[model samples]
Target: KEFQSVEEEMQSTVREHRDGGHAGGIFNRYNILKIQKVCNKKLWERYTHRRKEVSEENHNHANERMLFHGSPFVNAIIHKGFDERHAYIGGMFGAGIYFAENSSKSNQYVYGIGGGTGCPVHKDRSCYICHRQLLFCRVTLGKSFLQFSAMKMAHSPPGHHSVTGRPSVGLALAEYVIYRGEQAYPEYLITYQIMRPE
Candidate 1:
């Protein structure tokens, strides 16, 4: 199923399952509003609808497609069925971006407007809609222990786990040699902790 409208789902999940993280009495109104604002500006959405009729000579459903205008089978393949997307959204707001232009208009980022609010899914994935240009959509989740552990292994000496298990420099890197790769969009590393029901 499409898990892109995660704000509603997350709130519902928290209310129905978690007892305010079972400690803090759940997120407050301020937090909820913040989430709504974030979602309003940047979000992902999924929709299902009946097939449209082209009634054309070639019967090519290729050009008349609208947003969310394909079968679940198509979305399933393209999005991994929104699994990875939702995994990120569970920890942070969904990202919506439109990039790349001819040598005319200046670059821009639209987080608000009709872009994310209840929008359909096909806007970015369809070549016909997107016009063969690369549009990137990404979000980074908050810090987590597992991510720190991975960083440690990559940066530390073979046997060091942490600073004396207290406060000692087991290993240190004076400079960070990051290998940046070129792609459709900037490559970002994200970590997330999926919210679950008891």
Candidate 2:
């Protein structure tokens, strides 16, 4: 069952925080076609277990947050969860599963089906709109270690559960990185469309 309240929250989150910068086009108009809630029991269990562990270690809150993860392989992620092996090599904060608070920041990595086949919805030659998918994930950022400079580390800091790349002059958005896949659960899959400006 699709929850209307959750869908509305996702819509507002994307609509309000979407980047208004030069990237991802002018960010004029966007439409939400579907907001499917994930139903993987095992993944949910793992995420809950991890949250409990982190919460205990932190003595209280798990610092869980809803973040955006934009990727072309939405099917793979939905099936196996986020894998650090699939992360970009030598990423900004080392090779770890990355998540973004800003939907538009993640939008930079989303892609539509059929590489150059044009818009799948309206096969007409005049239609410039294309479809893309974005994932809203529940990320456990327990005691996140904030770092300003890039480091080539594999895991989080000694006592931290994740690494947070702070925004600087060069980087505009903050990025959360977790080494373990169980620290995140894909909650919703949002399929939206971007209408190209004439």
Candidate 3:
């Protein structure tokens, strides 16, 4: 079932699960604000959508950051069509991006909207994002550690099997590369413990 809101989901996850990370506490308030701000902006823009599928070559001219209106999916929503444009949230509040080699097929990573949030899975292998009862759309975001920039708009545990053998509930802490593909929208990567933020 879908949670009341993204914020509510985050708080619930934090309260229920304490993986020695920022579960019992709010880790940092700035991040909370950033996450909320990004979600709110996404919600508002979802209703007031636009249609602009910008490629890497032309993205330089548009607002590279926070280009919610420049998304093809938003464009489809506003224009009214059956086009399932690349589905991804437009914001970088609490996300860690990286790039790396396609090492072994055993590679894997976690992703979400931070606060211990995970991806919304489905019967099929496709990934989905739910926005209340309005939207429950699905999209392709690579798989395992084979594809580069798979979890672009998601989060994961930072360090390896626990930097010090401990669990991390935060999604931004996971390790992976931000594959700067040619697609108009950006994507994320998830490696073992290759790299993390300081």
Candidate 4:
């Protein structure tokens, strides 16, 4: 038999975003309740009314997409999900919503619908080195609103692919995406390979 300390046990477990809501068996009462309570209906139309007509150039990563306007039934279901904060939203995001958007398209209605972690606000590592994610201030060119909450992962951030062995900002490694633009949709978006302040 083996015994472990609290710190060791904590190190062994990680908070993961699972299918059909947060890392539980399925969408629970709180999950369903919060979404139903907070998510608005009419706002959904205002958010997804304008669809982006574009195609993915990289089919390799194209696995994580769903055309919300593909079918009448699907569109309707999508409307319902958005009305409930995506608690039951599946097929496209595996019951979890991705805080992601295409750089080419325009998502001018829904800017704060994303519920995932990590910053996709930088083009490359070099840019990150220059901007310093831990810094208190970000160089501003115009007026924009960006708010992000970072969650620490037991391991490195999900889907991270970049240089390693670099000094981490906080005690633990974290991730966040930088968003800047109007409240309607993000005008500028970037994804970083590491974690830092938003």
RMSD of every prediction:
20.5, 4.4, 17.5, 20.2
Note the residue pairs that clash in candidate 2.
Answer: none
Q: What ordering of candidates by lDDT runs from best to worst?
A: 2, 3, 4, 1
RMSD of 3: 17.5
| Candidate number with the higher TM-score (1 or 4) | 4
TM-score of each: 0.15, 0.81, 0.20, 0.18
lDDT of 4 at 39: 34
List lDDT for all candidates, in order: 0.19, 0.74, 0.23, 0.21
- Tens digit of lDDT per residue, candidate 1, span 22-44? 22112221122211111211122
Q: For model 3, how does the per-residue alpha-carbon lDDT over 83-103 read when each residue is reduced to its tens digit? A: 223324352311322221211
Specify the highest-lDDT model's number. 2
What lDDT does candidate 2 reach at residue 101?
Answer: 79
Return whichever of 3 and 4 wins on TM-score.
3
Clashes of each: 2, 0, 16, 10
Against the true structure, candidate 3 has what lDDT? 0.23
Candidate 4 per-residue C-alpha lDDT over 33-105 given as tens digits, one digit per residue, 9 for 90 to 100:
1111113345333433322110122222312221111111223333333222332323221222222221111
Question: How does model 1 score by TM-score?
Answer: 0.15
Error of 3 at 8 (Å): 2.3
